[PDB]
């Protein structure tokens, strides 16, 4: 038949979390031998057979080895806690190895979570071998090959190692890190090198933290505190590291860039309540400054997960040839309670309005074109619309709550981005989120409800939503892996978190239905936002008396 081919298509090439496939799976089995169309199919096949029969397992194992090779994302699904079997786990690891380093890095965070699911005895044995294949051996081998990987891997392990089930995973992660440092210490010249560099980073942060704690103890309003901060950095050999000069250190935030000194005067502290510094650094090359922020008191693991998410979505959209000019900025955590964040030069939307009446005035000031469209250079408008679309959709998919003018920022080229992703998957302090988050001023920024640009924005949202809908599996698989993740919003209900993103993605609906649905959310949110729209609705209510 031909109908048969299509019912199968819905099943192998639609949803990954679905345990849905039920008996149809048995039907899948028959075609399975004749045609394993694709990799997507392999992931689906694996789900149905395993537990019941040893002989059935033998046939499946042979089937998997023969099978057309799976794509990496599916590999993540395999590393998931759902699949117990060692051979499938090994196969999943083989898939990862084949993948290029940069892609391997993007996932890395999940791979560390994945570590929890890999059997403990592999890890105890490996330890046994080092003191008086399996994935953890794989992560260490790969981590050693590449310095940047070594660096993130080290930072992720260390975040886990500091102070019920916490005990089992902590001992195990601790085991992993000790092994990693010991492999580097022995390794050769390049590995020894990696080890020294980390030693340096660790030392630098500790002193940086010490200085920060002194600043907090010292009393004053922010400015008095900041002046004090400037003074400490300039103070030579109060600290183990001298902040005005040091030996070059690959930035922990970015491993690629060494730093030299810090400039005491260029350091500010932020308006936000928990006060984080901007710092500047010089860099090893040509003296170029870098800045990052550094944050005194918060666990950023949540922020890093969301940013990875935004980075990933952006990568996917870009291959599709959609650039929404999203800015994913680097975060890392250090310890829980400190990290860095990349600094983007921007003005907070609230600052822009306070300081320039409206967004347009501010853009116009930076990029005047007499000729169009708002007396603002066309490209800036374009980037602003695109950033807006990218963010509504991503904020919506990732269920990001708690946005405000302090929260959004702008750039001088136009882009908008978000910040401070403390509320995730629809947690909001408030009782009633709008489903889509657009400030009145942002809508006005587009020249109101009826403008060419507003239409461009909605068109753009639908397209972006549709593309993400298509590339579901990867995000769902990364979330599947973040169940026991120690990200607070996920921690409230582990299970519901994966389900929530799936619900937002709206995979059930047909494409025409999904666009209509999205349109509906945008519309309620925008009507609520505009006052003219609200008075007009009152008028319609009134019309029936």
Ligand X SMILES: CC(=O)/N=c1/[nH]c(C)c(-c2ccc(Cl)c(S(=O)(=O)NCCO)c2)s1
Binding site for ligand X (CB under 6 A): 270, 272, 276, 293, 295, 329, 341, 343-344, 346, 348, 406-407, 409, 419-420
Binding-site partner at residue 544 among ligand X, its own copies, none, CB < 5 to 8 Å by type: its own copies
Instruction: Report whether 180 contacts 155 (CB < 8 A).
Output: no
Cβ at position 117, least distance to ligand X in Å:
30
Q: Which CB, 255 or 422, lies closer to ligand X? A: 422
225 Cα distance to chain centroid: 33
Q: Which CB, 409 or 529, lies closer to ligand X? A: 409
HSE-CB of 494 using CA atoms within 13 angstroms:
7
Distance CA 353, CA 36 (A): 58
Cβ at position 540, least distance to its own copies in Å:
3
Cβ at position 427, least distance to its own copies in Å:
14
Cβ at position 21, least distance to its own copies in Å:
23
The H or E element containing residue 342 is strand 339-342
Binding-site partner at residue 523 among ligand X, its own copies, none, CB < 5 to 8 Å by type: its own copies
Q: Which CB, 169 or 405, lies closer to ligand X? A: 405
For 68, the token pair is 């057309």
Binding-site partner at residue 276 among its own copies, ligand X, none, CB < 5 to 8 Å by type: ligand X
For 258, the 3-state DSSP assignment is: strand
Sign of CA dihedral 8, 12, 13, 18: positive
HSE-CB of 516 using CA atoms within 13 angstroms:
5
Cβ at position 274, least distance to ligand X in Å:
6
Q: Which CB, 399 or 422, lies closer to ligand X? A: 422
User: Residue with the closest Cβ to ligand X?
Assistant: 272
- Taking residue 62's Cβ as centre, other Cβ atoms within 10 Å add up to 10
Q: Which CB, 7 or 534, lies closer to its own copies? A: 534
Q: Which CB, 113 or 407, lies closer to ligand X? A: 407
Distance CA 297, CA 337 (A): 4
Q: Which CB, 230 or 407, lies closer to ligand X? A: 407
Instruction: Report whether 301 contacts 424 (CB < 8 A).
Output: no
Cβ at position 486, least distance to ligand X in Å:
18
Instruction: Report whether 269 contacts 276 (CB < 8 A).
Output: yes
Binding-site partner at residue 270 among ligand X, its own copies, none, CB < 5 to 8 Å by type: ligand X
Cβ at position 432, least distance to its own copies in Å:
4
Going by the DSSP 8-state scheme, the letter that residue 229 receives in this structure is H
Distance CA 305, CA 332 (A): 10
| Lateral strand order in the sheet of 416-417 | 347-348, 409-410, 416-417
User: H/E/C letters for each residue in 44-100?
Assistant: HHHHHHCCCCHHHHHHHHHHHHHCCCCCHHHHHHHHCCCCCCHHHHHHHHHHHHHCC
Binding-site partner at residue 484 among its own copies, ligand X, none, CB < 5 to 8 Å by type: none
Binding-site partner at residue 543 among its own copies, ligand X, none, CB < 5 to 8 Å by type: its own copies
Q: Which CB, 265 or 524, lies closer to its own copies? A: 524
Cβ at position 460, least distance to its own copies in Å:
15
Binding-site partner at residue 525 among its own copies, ligand X, none, CB < 5 to 8 Å by type: its own copies
Distance CA 285, CA 258 (A): 8
Cβ at position 26, least distance to ligand X in Å:
50
Backbone angles phi, psi at 267, to 5 degrees: -75, 125
Binding-site partner at residue 348 among its own copies, ligand X, none, CB < 5 to 8 Å by type: ligand X
For 254, the 3-state DSSP assignment is: coil
Q: Which CB, 217 or 430, lies closer to its own copies? A: 430
Cβ at position 253, least distance to ligand X in Å:
12
Q: Which CB, 344 or 524, lies closer to ligand X? A: 344
Interacting residues toward its own copies by CB under 8 A? 404-405, 430-434, 439-440, 512, 515-516, 519-520, 523-525, 527-529, 531, 534, 536-545
For 382, the token pair is 């374009």
Binding-site partner at residue 246 among its own copies, ligand X, none, CB < 5 to 8 Å by type: none
Q: Which CB, 241 or 518, lies closer to its own copies? A: 518
Instruction: Report whether 232 contacts 214 (CB < 8 A).
Output: yes
- Calculate the CA dihedral of residues 502, 506, 510, 511 and round it to 10 degrees: -110
Cβ at position 344, least distance to ligand X in Å:
4
Instruction: Report whether 325 contacts 386 (CB < 8 A).
Output: yes
Alpha helices by DSSP H, 367-510: 378-397, 440-444, 452-470, 472-480, 488-491, 494-505
Binding-site partner at residue 487 among its own copies, ligand X, none, CB < 5 to 8 Å by type: none
Binding-site partner at residue 407 among its own copies, ligand X, none, CB < 5 to 8 Å by type: ligand X
Instruction: Report whether 257 contacts 215 (CB < 8 A).
Output: no
Cβ at position 512, least distance to its own copies in Å:
5
Q: At a CB cut-off of 8 Å and minimum separation 6, what does 3 contact?
A: none
Q: Which CB, 164 or 539, lies closer to its own copies? A: 539
Binding-site partner at residue 329 among its own copies, ligand X, none, CB < 5 to 8 Å by type: ligand X
């Amino acid at each position: 038949a031909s109908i048969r081919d299509q019912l199968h298509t819905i099943v192998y090439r639609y949803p990954p979390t679905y345990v849905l496939s039920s008996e149809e799976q048995d039907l899948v089995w028959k075609f399975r031998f004749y045609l394993s169309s694709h990799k997507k199919a392999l992931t689906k096949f694996l789900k149905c057979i395993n537990w019941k029969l040893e002989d059935e397992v033998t046939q499946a194992l042979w089937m998997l080895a023969n099978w057309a090779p799976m794509d990496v994302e599916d590999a993540l699904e395999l590393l998931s806690p759902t699949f117990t079997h060692p051979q499938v786990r090994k196969y999943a690891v083989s898939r990862l190895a084949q993948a290029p380093d940069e892609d391997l890095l993007l996932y890395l965070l999940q791979l560390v979570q994945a570590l929890k699911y890999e059997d403990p005895r592999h890890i105890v044995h490996l330890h046994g071998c080092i003191f008086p294949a399996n994935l953890c051996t794989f992560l260490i081998q790969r981590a050693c090959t590449n310095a940047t990987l070594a660096n993130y891997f080290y930072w992720y392990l260390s975040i886990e190692v500091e102070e019920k089930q916490d005990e089992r995973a902590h001992d195990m992660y601790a085991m992993v890190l000790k092994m990693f440092l010991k492999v580097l210490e022995n390794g050769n010249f390049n590995l020894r090198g990696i080890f020294y560099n980390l030693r340096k980073q660790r030392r630098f942060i500790d002193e940086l933290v010490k200085l920060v704690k002194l600043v907090a103890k010292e009393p004053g309003n922010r400015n008095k505190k900041t002046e004090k901060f400037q003074k400490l950095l300039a103070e030579q050999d109060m600290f183990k590291v001298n902040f005005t000069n040091f030996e070059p250190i690959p930035f922990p935030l970015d491993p690629e860039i060494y730093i030299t000194k810090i400039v005491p005067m260029r350091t500010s502290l932020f308006k936000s309540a928990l006060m984080p510094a901007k710092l500047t650094f010089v860099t090893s090359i040509a003296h170029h400054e870098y800045a990052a922020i550094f944050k005194h008191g918060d666990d950023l693991r949540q922020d890093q997960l969301i940013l990875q998410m935004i980075t990933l979505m952006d990568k996917l959209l870009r291959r599709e040839n959609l650039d929404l000019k999203l800015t994913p900025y680097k975060v890392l955590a250090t310890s829980s309670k400190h990290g860095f964040l990349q600094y983007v030069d921007s003005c907070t939307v609230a600052e822009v309005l306070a300081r320039e009446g409206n967004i347009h005035n501010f853009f116009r000031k930076h990029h005047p074109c007499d000729n169009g469209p708002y007396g603002i250079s066309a490209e800036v408008m374009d980037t602003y619309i695109k950033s807006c679309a990218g963010y509504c959709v991503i904020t919506y998919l990732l269920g990001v709550g708690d946005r405000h003018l302090d929260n959004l920022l702008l750039t001088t080229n136009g882009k908008l981005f978000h910040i401070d992703f403390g509320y995730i998957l629809g947690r909001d302090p408030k009782p009633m989120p709008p489903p889509m988050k657009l400030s009145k001023e942002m809508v006005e920024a587009m020249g109101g409800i009826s403008s060419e640009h507003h239409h461009e924005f909605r068109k753009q949202c639908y397209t972006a939503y549709l593309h993400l809908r298509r590339h579901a599996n990867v995000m769902l698989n990364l979330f599947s892996l973040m169940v026991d993740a120690t990200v607070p919003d996920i921690a409230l209900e582990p299970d519901k978190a994966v389900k929530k993103v799936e619900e937002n993605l709206q995979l059930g609906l047909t494409d025409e239905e999904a666009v209509q649905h999205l349109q509906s959310l945008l519309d309620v949110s925008i009507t609520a936002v505009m006052p003219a729209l609200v008075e007009q609705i009152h008028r319609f209510t009134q019309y029936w008396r």
